[PDB]
PDB file of all heavy atoms in Angstrom:
ATOM      1  N   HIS A 579       0.484  78.681  24.390  1.00 30.78           N
ATOM      2  CA  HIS A 579      -0.100  79.190  23.105  1.00 30.78           C
ATOM      3  C   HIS A 579      -0.706  80.597  23.331  1.00 30.78           C
ATOM      4  O   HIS A 579      -0.640  81.455  22.424  1.00 30.78           O
ATOM      5  CB  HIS A 579      -1.233  78.206  22.605  1.00 30.78           C
ATOM      6  CG  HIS A 579      -1.740  78.561  21.205  1.00 30.78           C
ATOM      7  ND1 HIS A 579      -2.900  79.217  21.067  1.00 30.78           N
ATOM      8  CD2 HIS A 579      -1.247  78.357  20.009  1.00 30.78           C
ATOM      9  CE1 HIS A 579      -3.085  79.473  19.777  1.00 30.78           C
ATOM     10  NE2 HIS A 579      -2.089  78.909  19.087  1.00 30.78           N
ATOM     11  N   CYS A 584      -1.116  84.062  18.951  1.00 28.99           N
ATOM     12  CA  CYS A 584      -0.973  83.476  17.645  1.00 28.99           C
ATOM     13  C   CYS A 584      -1.879  84.116  16.652  1.00 28.99           C
ATOM     14  O   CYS A 584      -3.034  84.336  16.908  1.00 28.99           O
ATOM     15  CB  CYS A 584      -1.330  81.918  17.710  1.00 28.99           C
ATOM     16  SG  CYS A 584      -1.058  80.991  16.248  1.00 28.99           S
ATOM     17  N   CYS A 587      -4.090  80.812  14.441  1.00 25.64           N
ATOM     18  CA  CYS A 587      -5.277  80.064  14.845  1.00 25.64           C
ATOM     19  C   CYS A 587      -6.491  80.875  15.141  1.00 25.64           C
ATOM     20  O   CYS A 587      -6.383  81.920  15.702  1.00 25.64           O
ATOM     21  CB  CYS A 587      -4.795  79.337  16.086  1.00 25.64           C
ATOM     22  SG  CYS A 587      -3.423  78.317  15.911  1.00 25.64           S
ATOM     23  N   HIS A 611      -0.105  74.008  15.606  1.00 37.36           N
ATOM     24  CA  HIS A 611      -0.843  74.242  16.771  1.00 37.36           C
ATOM     25  C   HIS A 611      -2.111  73.397  16.522  1.00 37.36           C
ATOM     26  O   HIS A 611      -2.757  73.353  15.392  1.00 37.36           O
ATOM     27  CB  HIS A 611      -1.126  75.701  17.022  1.00 37.36           C
ATOM     28  CG  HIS A 611       0.006  76.542  17.089  1.00 37.36           C
ATOM     29  ND1 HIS A 611      -0.045  77.928  16.873  1.00 37.36           N
ATOM     30  CD2 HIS A 611       1.311  76.309  17.307  1.00 37.36           C
ATOM     31  CE1 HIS A 611       1.205  78.420  16.993  1.00 37.36           C
ATOM     32  NE2 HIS A 611       2.021  77.421  17.336  1.00 37.36           N
TER      33      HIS A 611
HETATM   34 ZN1  LIG B 701      -1.511  79.016  17.127  1.00 46.45          ZN
END
Side-chain angles (χ1 to χ4, degrees):
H579 187 266
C584 186
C587 307
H611 304 158

